[PDB]
């Protein structure tokens, strides 16, 4: 009686890839019959395959601020390379070993095909012209317009483009003159309810202006010729031109080089938790600013003694998760999440509770280089300290 077992392989076809993707439109106009070209990169810049989307991955319409498939649905699969979706995306033995070791595989977006839908004047219907596409149009928008990026609404980058005058082109000098103030008014929704530019009750001086080099050289010459120094006084005397890039950010925060706010300065870090809803050893409801709500990683729970002593519960990297989102906008950070479902056993009501914060400019994912899996490599801010007999 025998018993055998065989296991073959082929070192050019060892594994097959299936990728779950989702399309986003964040512009100002819809795009029809969408087909993105996209490439799967392994490691630094070693491309496995480049796949124009087949007929299975076609989005018929992507209206702005929408998704395909919509966010309550599972993503679509991109798993073929043949023009008829019959041949998979494959990888050899060395790429498979490197992917299993280092786990680095990302997805680039090289371009997007898509059609335009125009108004038919006879019956009023809107019809998709399948000859014209958006690749013949956007390079004419990008060469005649100034660009302004702005994150004064939910700290999200919103990009607009405003038709400004190029002075060395006869057709482009026929457009109307564009100031920076009128561009801010008609592009985003700034107004002057008393005489001062405001974005929903926030003054213009609460934002700062960062330009590109050519744009900053132009703005500097405009300020020299105006005999002015502050840009905030001559906002209706700054002429925009084509191919400008202006970036307007909220002045409080610190940003990385993708312009994402991750950390504020310490005074407004402390000034965010003034009115308090729930204060018990069971939980903590709190009214926090929505702007500073998302920039922080998580809070730490410990108890301040009279002698001087703290009882660090969140002394690790894993459970710096603290939040639990409720339907009122206020998260309830209830303290039986990492405590074997127990309250804070304060043994003496002459004690104080103590809550410190972690921001993402000091948050780490790995442990330290030695054996430190603690909060020894982070920097914290003081927020919450009351006395211990009004807690219960």
């Amino acid at each position: 009686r025998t018993w055998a077992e065989t296991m073959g392989l082929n070192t050019a076809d060892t594994a097959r890839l299936n990728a779950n993707i989702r399309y986003v439109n964040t512009g100002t106009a819809p795009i029809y019959n969408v087909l993105p070209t996209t490439s799967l990169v392994l490691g630094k810049n070693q491309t496995l395959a480049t796949i124009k989307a087949k007929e299975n991955q076609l989005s018929q319409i992507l209206a702005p601020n929408n998704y395909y498939p919509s966010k309550n649905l599972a993503p679509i699969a991109l798993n073929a390379q043949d023009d008829f979706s019959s041949t998979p995306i494959t990888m050899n033995y060395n790429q498979f070993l490197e992917l299993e070791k280092t786990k680095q595989l990302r997805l680039d977006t090289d371009q997007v095909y898509g059609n335009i839908a125009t108004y038919n004047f006879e019956n009023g219907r809107v019809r998709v012209d399948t000859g014209s596409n958006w690749s013949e149009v956007l390079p004419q928008i990008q060469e005649t317009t100034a660009r302004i990026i702005f994150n004064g609404k939910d700290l999200n980058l919103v990009e607009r483009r405003i038709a400004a005058v190029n002075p060395s082109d006869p057709l482009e000098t026929t457009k109307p003159d564009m100031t920076l103030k009128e561009a801010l008014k008609i592009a985003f929704g700034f107004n002057e309810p008393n005489g001062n530019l405001q974005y929903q009750g926030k003054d213009i001086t609460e934002f700062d202006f960062n330009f590109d080099q050519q744009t900053s050289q132009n703005i500097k010459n405009q300020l020299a010729e105006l005999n002015a120094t502050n840009i905030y006084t001559v906002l209706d005397k700054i002429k925009l031109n084509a191919k400008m890039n202006i970036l307007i950010r909220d002045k409080r925060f610190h940003y990385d080089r993708n312009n994402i706010a991750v950390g504020a300065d310490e005074s407004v870090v402390k000034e965010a938790h003034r009115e308090v809803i729930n204060s018990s050893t069971e939980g903590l409801l709190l009214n926090i600013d929505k702007d500073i709500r998302k920039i922080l990683s998580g809070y730490i729970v410990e108890i301040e003694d009279t002698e001087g002593l703290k009882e660090v519960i969140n002394d690790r990297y894993d459970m710096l998760n603290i939040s639990s989102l409720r339907q009122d906008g206020k998260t309830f950070i209830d303290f039986k999440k990492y405590n074997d479902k127990l309250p804070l056993y304060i043994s003496n009501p002459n004690y104080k509770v103590n809550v410190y914060a972690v921001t993402k400019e000091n948050t780490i994912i790995n442990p330290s280089e030695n054996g430190d899996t603690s909060t020894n490599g982070i920097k914290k801010i003081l927020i919450f300290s009351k006395k211990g007999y009004e807690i219960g």
Binding site: T6, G8, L17, V24, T28, P75
Partner: protein
Amino acid sequence: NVSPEARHPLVAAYPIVHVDMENIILSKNEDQSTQNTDSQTRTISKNTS
């Protein structure tokens, strides 16, 4: 579907599409096989020495 701020003549209207990846599913193309065998025999023999 053109957003209302882009109904001005001086604000452009254009889409900004980008794909993002939520999951990668790899599947090791490898073929395997088992086998079981029984074998009986019976021999009779004789010599004249």
